Design a protein around this ligand. Sequence first.
Ligand SMILES: *[C@@H]1O[C@H](CO)[C@@H](O[C@@H]2O[C@H](CO)[C@@H](O[C@@H]3O[C@H](CO)[C@@H](O)[C@H](O)[C@@H]3O)[C@H](O)[C@H]2NC(C)=O)[C@H](O)[C@H]1NC(C)=O
Ligand SMILES: *[C@@H]1O[C@H](CO)[C@@H](O[C@@H]2O[C@H](CO)[C@@H](O[C@@H]3O[C@H](CO)[C@@H](O)[C@H](O)[C@@H]3O)[C@H](O)[C@H]2NC(C)=O)[C@H](O)[C@H]1NC(C)=O
Ligand SMILES: *[C@@H]1O[C@H](CO)[C@@H](O[C@@H]2O[C@H](CO)[C@@H](O[C@@H]3O[C@H](CO)[C@@H](O)[C@H](O)[C@@H]3O)[C@H](O)[C@H]2NC(C)=O)[C@H](O)[C@H]1NC(C)=O
Ligand SMILES: *[C@@H]1O[C@H](CO)[C@@H](O[C@@H]2O[C@H](CO)[C@@H](O)[C@H](O)[C@H]2NC(C)=O)[C@H](O)[C@H]1NC(C)=O
Ligand SMILES: *[C@@H]1O[C@H](CO)[C@@H](O[C@@H]2O[C@H](CO)[C@@H](O)[C@H](O)[C@H]2NC(C)=O)[C@H](O)[C@H]1NC(C)=O
Ligand SMILES: *[C@@H]1O[C@H](CO)[C@@H](O[C@@H]2O[C@H](CO)[C@@H](O)[C@H](O)[C@H]2NC(C)=O)[C@H](O)[C@H]1NC(C)=O
Lengths: 324, 324, 324, 177, 177, 177
Amino acid sequence: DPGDQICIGYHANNSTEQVDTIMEKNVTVTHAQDILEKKHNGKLCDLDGVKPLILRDCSVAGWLLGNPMCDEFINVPEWSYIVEKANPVNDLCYPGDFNDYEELKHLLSRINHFEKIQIIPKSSWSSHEASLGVSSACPYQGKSSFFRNVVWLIKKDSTYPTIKRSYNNTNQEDLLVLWGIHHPNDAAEQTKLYQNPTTYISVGTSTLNQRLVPRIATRSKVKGLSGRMEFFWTILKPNDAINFESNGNFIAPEYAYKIVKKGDSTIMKSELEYGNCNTKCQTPMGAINSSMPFHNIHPLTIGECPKYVKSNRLVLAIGLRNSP
Amino acid sequence: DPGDQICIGYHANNSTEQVDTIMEKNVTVTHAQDILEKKHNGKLCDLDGVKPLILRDCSVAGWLLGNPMCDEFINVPEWSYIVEKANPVNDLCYPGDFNDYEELKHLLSRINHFEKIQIIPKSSWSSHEASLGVSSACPYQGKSSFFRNVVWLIKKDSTYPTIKRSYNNTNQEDLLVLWGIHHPNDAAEQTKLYQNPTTYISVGTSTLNQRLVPRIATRSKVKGLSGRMEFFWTILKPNDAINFESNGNFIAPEYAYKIVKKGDSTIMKSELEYGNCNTKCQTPMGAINSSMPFHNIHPLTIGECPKYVKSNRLVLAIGLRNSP
Amino acid sequence: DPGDQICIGYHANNSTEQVDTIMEKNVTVTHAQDILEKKHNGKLCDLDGVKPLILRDCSVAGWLLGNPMCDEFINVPEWSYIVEKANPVNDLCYPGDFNDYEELKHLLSRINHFEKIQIIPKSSWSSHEASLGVSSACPYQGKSSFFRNVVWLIKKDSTYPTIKRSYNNTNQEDLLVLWGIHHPNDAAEQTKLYQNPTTYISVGTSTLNQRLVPRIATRSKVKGLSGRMEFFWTILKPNDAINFESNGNFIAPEYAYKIVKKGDSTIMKSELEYGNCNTKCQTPMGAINSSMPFHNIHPLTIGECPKYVKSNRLVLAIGLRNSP
Amino acid sequence: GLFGAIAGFIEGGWQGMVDGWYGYHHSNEQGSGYAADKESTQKAIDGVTNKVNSIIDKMNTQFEAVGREFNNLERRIENLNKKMEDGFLDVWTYNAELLVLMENERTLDFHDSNVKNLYDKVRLQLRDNAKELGNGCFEFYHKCDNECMESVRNGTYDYPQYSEEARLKREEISSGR
Amino acid sequence: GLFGAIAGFIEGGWQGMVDGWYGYHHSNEQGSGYAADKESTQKAIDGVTNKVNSIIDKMNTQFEAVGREFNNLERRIENLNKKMEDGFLDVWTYNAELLVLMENERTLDFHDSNVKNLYDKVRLQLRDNAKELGNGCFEFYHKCDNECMESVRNGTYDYPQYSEEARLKREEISSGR
Amino acid sequence: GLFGAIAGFIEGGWQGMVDGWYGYHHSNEQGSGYAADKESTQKAIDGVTNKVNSIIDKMNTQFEAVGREFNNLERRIENLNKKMEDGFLDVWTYNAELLVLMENERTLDFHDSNVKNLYDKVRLQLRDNAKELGNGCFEFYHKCDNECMESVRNGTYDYPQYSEEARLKREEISSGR
Ligand SMILES: *[C@@H]1O[C@H](CO)[C@@H](O[C@@H]2O[C@H](CO)[C@@H](O[C@@H]3O[C@H](CO)[C@@H](O)[C@H](O)[C@@H]3O)[C@H](O)[C@H]2NC(C)=O)[C@H](O)[C@H]1NC(C)=O
Ligand SMILES: *[C@@H]1O[C@H](CO)[C@@H](O[C@@H]2O[C@H](CO)[C@@H](O[C@@H]3O[C@H](CO)[C@@H](O)[C@H](O)[C@@H]3O)[C@H](O)[C@H]2NC(C)=O)[C@H](O)[C@H]1NC(C)=O
Ligand SMILES: *[C@@H]1O[C@H](CO)[C@@H](O[C@@H]2O[C@H](CO)[C@@H](O[C@@H]3O[C@H](CO)[C@@H](O)[C@H](O)[C@@H]3O)[C@H](O)[C@H]2NC(C)=O)[C@H](O)[C@H]1NC(C)=O
Ligand SMILES: *[C@@H]1O[C@H](CO)[C@@H](O[C@@H]2O[C@H](CO)[C@@H](O)[C@H](O)[C@H]2NC(C)=O)[C@H](O)[C@H]1NC(C)=O
Ligand SMILES: *[C@@H]1O[C@H](CO)[C@@H](O[C@@H]2O[C@H](CO)[C@@H](O)[C@H](O)[C@H]2NC(C)=O)[C@H](O)[C@H]1NC(C)=O
Ligand SMILES: *[C@@H]1O[C@H](CO)[C@@H](O[C@@H]2O[C@H](CO)[C@@H](O)[C@H](O)[C@H]2NC(C)=O)[C@H](O)[C@H]1NC(C)=O
């Protein structure tokens, strides 16, 4: 005969979730909680509302200078973030250098919209030749061409009279202005294009005080050319003025960019393309839609995102140890 | 019948100190210990014995070159740390540039005292005009004037004969030397001020090898002026000599600075003024007087200070859990 | 009368190992484990198979340019890591400068072997004097001399005809190439050495476009000399060509270096010399031979090594507490 | 575990207790059944939810990597840049992995301590009115119906009330009959 | 807590024990009173003061910010510079706060462990010479004066000495009159 | 320690048990001796070995300092470079030193928890067939040979089997003789 009884015990079930501990691995428990997000959609999406500027085979340089092969991006709408490939094919179509180029790429990460404006009209070049500035290194479509936002001026008749051109920024927003100098291959070519043998480019701002001088040298062929192009940039503050003076080898501006909207942004390196989707967290490898507090997709994300970690596994133990 | 008794119990009291724990927040305990100092006195004080260099409305640049409006700091006494406002008003009174300026400010964070010494007498300029180098951009008090430590040389009669001057650092300490060049607006002004149209400033050391050339350009007006001044600096090692040769556009030194005591220091950004107090821990927001191991005032401290963290609260549990 | 008994107890022994814990220091226990390695062998060793490059008193500059006193390293074998003293004695024997020198040192950390090649034969300078390029600041052994991998050309008879020289890299690996320019003391000396008073050095690559000009200045004597030499470098890509042109003041190449093997490497700063030993872990203080997971020798180690920490003691507790 | 209850003197957990982590299994004359302890179950849930939230919250702000680009003769700072972003990514992975690991242990020994502290809240209510069997169950020396079991569950159990019947049942088993 | 002593089987602490953290409350023929256990109180003080010092001492050196200035075309390294100084300050804040939370718990379960260990040192001295009430108090089966209570406190308590008087009082209660 | 066994009710350890950490000391008619518990000793070894590997292994990746050189006008970033590499070494040193200190404590209270849990496995096998001495030893109320001690060690011990002999020996001490 059994006298009345009472027992104390604990929960168990059919759960085979496993957790880990400093002293013990793979311990099976009642309840667990995963905190690591591991899945993405392999696609580039809009961020909340907004579509990213996806340069395809274009570089930041190609777009802003206006490489002919970059005509897709002649007047871009506002972006959330820029996507650029690792080695864009259409950079500086005519071989050369973009000065302080990285620092320019930096300003772009807090810029969300530009507005292209003409500050020296191509029609205005009455005593020089605006339309002979064309290269085989810069092909539009078989027709050989040039960068669109800038102008490769050349001598008229036999002469190249001194240029004095100026633009006063009467806008309220900052202006990104681009220009350049051309470095010929020998004195013979120099005097053929520009007449005058000893030349310069001076550029005046309330802050700039520049005088560039073309630099003759014998060089290896790049894309069939030995000459080179070297580009330069500035920010023109509101109510300030930029003043050009030159005498040869001047690659003059036509269009500049007004900085119209600033904000969170980034230049994202990725080979992917537009995914026609939308998320609140984007990664160079795909977008994330998740409640997890942690992910291990890629450290460079933009938007309302989980915190990045490198783990393969992060699971918390919540319930109690489940029966052997 | 009460049999004899013995009981085991624990302390309790009238303390309402609350701590937090991983599983429970605001747990009331017997004894607690705050380790975070949160109070400062909002003043800029001496640091132990020594009074800080407080530039009121001057910058490091305005002080060192001797902006006429900065006469307060003409002969500063030894200091403990420098304090500079975020956007000082009296900087380079004549518009232009201070070369490698940050890297110079970097050195100041370990300099505690200078001694201004005259290395090229203003009176010595016998065949040039020392006393005409004066600008309306550089006002003393309505009298238009100029930087005090450098001299703006000008042609005398009609000519500007080639300058050759040199100073041999016969001190046992390092010399901070300053000088500069002027960029006029046109060919006209160049020949008006200096006669000679094609000019240079050469500067020589055991390590320096510089040849500056004035850079004519059309620029926006700054303070009513279109000209520019561009200043340079070097550390002249003991028993070394520096050599100047120039020919126009030379803004020559009179005084330089011997680095006389080095040590810990910093340049602190702050809007404050002198506080007429004294401490052993100073912060751009005010001084700290505390025994606590932690504070949350400001990350940039100089002196014997608690370690900074970003918390609002850090309290350790000492006693035991206090009665419900 | 004692009834039968059973007791439960624990291990103890003759151990005086002490560990620490958060609440208690120096707690003596049964078994402990040290995990901190504290010993090294005070010598610089081979790293697995390979001998380190030990410059004795040379700097990296001295080696590559070919300082006469640096003849030990005229054709060094493949290395595992380079060791350099804190302030090498045999640097640039002729006073001057090595441009972007640190950026070059950085490249060295991924290079294990060069192969010196002749790209412009000292014999070919048919209309200039290759053999007068010699200085008292550059002594061999009393015989004054010059850097060996480059050649200081001087005017022949009374003239200095314009140089045009070039090399096309037909090798399959990259080429480190060096050259330099000479800064005279005055106009008088300029024409004595080179005849032409106004001179230049141009260098062209698929990516370079340089035009250097000598910089006359009155300067302090260094090693009894007032003039200066300034040296430059570039990497010449396979199938690319370099073209020199000058007119005076040119310090022309003879030899350049082909990068033949890349891999892990470092430039280790140390005063030590060759240890005639061998490791799997090397340190600027001595080699480490250990199973320990941690060491506290020096943070800069190369090879299969323990992780560095600054601690003086790291011991884990393994057994249980040893009797009071 | 540290406290010797779970997977201890209580071999096995009860598949049948489906409304709590910890509980009771009574067995008197009227029959048997399962009943979960509400206060200790609730005491642990609040403890675990505060733990989960303390962990997610501590990693709220944590280093966030940013894209920076450097050219070809900026190799030095480029490398400084990389080791930095890598460095912090390494720190914060270690902080995360280790925190889960350490607090995973402390979570399991909490459930253990909770069961054993529940076992002893019962042990010190009954005392000599019942016999501790050693498997985590108690055998009464008196009769205890359903309203008495309830007094045990919620802590109402009256000792002087049953101590008389118990001390007489003890006498009955000491003698032998 | 974890050990079921503080706010456990000992519900409530004694407002009247003003000379220690842990202690006793005796009650015999002569009267009653409080007596704090001085060495266990002293042994916990030594542990907690070492804990406070361990925490302050591990933060000996920790990142110290330095002021650095940059120009308009040095934006890249300027940005690099902020993320790092920010980076480390976030690490040391995370570490400070996290160590305080963790060792706060281990402190409270330390005091808990100290009570439950004090209750059982007395319990295994007395054994069956006193009856466990379960409320953290003991009821003796023999007479114990002030020189006898003191023998329990400092650990002097003699079991065979009182075992005769006690085993006869156990039997008087077996009979129950 | 935390659980009151080591340096608790078991004052002192047995110099004589050279084949394990925790164990038994039998004492019957045939004589006495030391015998180590095979199962509990192994349970701690696996735990300590996994901790030792867990600690080394988490320091898998950690900041590795690298050489960088800077010129005379790169003074600022020279300083940035230095405070960074320094910074990370301070972090990883602190992360390491602190982890051992913390896992040193938990290690000692693991062994403590293990002894006290072996004592209770036996106490809850025997119950009233033996008398609890309080020094960690049990005195049987019955006769127990070497195959009986073994039944206790490996957990085979039969309670109803000896319960009659023990309950008669309990009554003899009730009478006085
Ligand atoms: C670019 O064009 C802008 C167009 O607005 C010009 O800015 C204007 O300049 C005039 C003087 O030429 C300023 O007028 C002055 O106002 C001040 C008080 O603020 C007074 O002291 C003067 O007597 C004068 O009346 C006017 O402020 C300014 N406009 C704005 C919107 O600020 C400017 O001339 C051109 N910029 C350059 C660099 O050439
Ligand atoms: C600038 O002034 C310093 C200090 O007055 C001068 O340096 C001194 O120069 C003389 C030569 O005119 C040195 O004398 C020499 O001593 C060496 C041994 O050190 C000896 O071998 C020579 O035969 C010669 O007589 C003197 O030592 C030196 N003093 C110091 C302290 O260095 C010099 O006039 C100027 N220095 C420069 C770099 O222009
Ligand atoms: C440096 O020397 C290299 C090594 O010979 C030269 O590279 C070669 O350049 C020639 C042109 O002179 C290339 O010939 C071409 O062949 C391709 C087919 O392979 C064809 O597309 C063209 O119609 C042309 O005939 C040759 O491919 C190329 N070799 C390699 C391996 O790429 C080069 O000329 C020299 N560089 C300079 C700047 O002079
Ligand atoms: C932990 O459990 C897992 C699950 O079986 C094991 O980890 C590995 O899991 C993969 C599948 O993802 C299987 O190939 C093996 O089961 C495991 N691989 C290896 C290489 O071991 C593992 O067995 C358990 N870990 C430990 C330490 O016991
Ligand atoms: C911690 O205790 C305080 C006691 O008031 C609480 O802290 C917060 O502060 C405001 C005003 O000081 C209180 O009215 C609120 O209760 C708290 N604010 C918020 C936004 O929660 C708080 O109640 C306690 N903490 C927790 C987690 O309950
Ligand atoms: C830890 O034990 C050692 C035992 O020597 C002590 O640490 C130091 O070492 C010297 C001998 O080398 C001792 O005499 C000193 O006590 C210590 N030196 C210094 C400079 O303090 C120490 O006694 C113990 N540590 C603590 C905190 O008690």
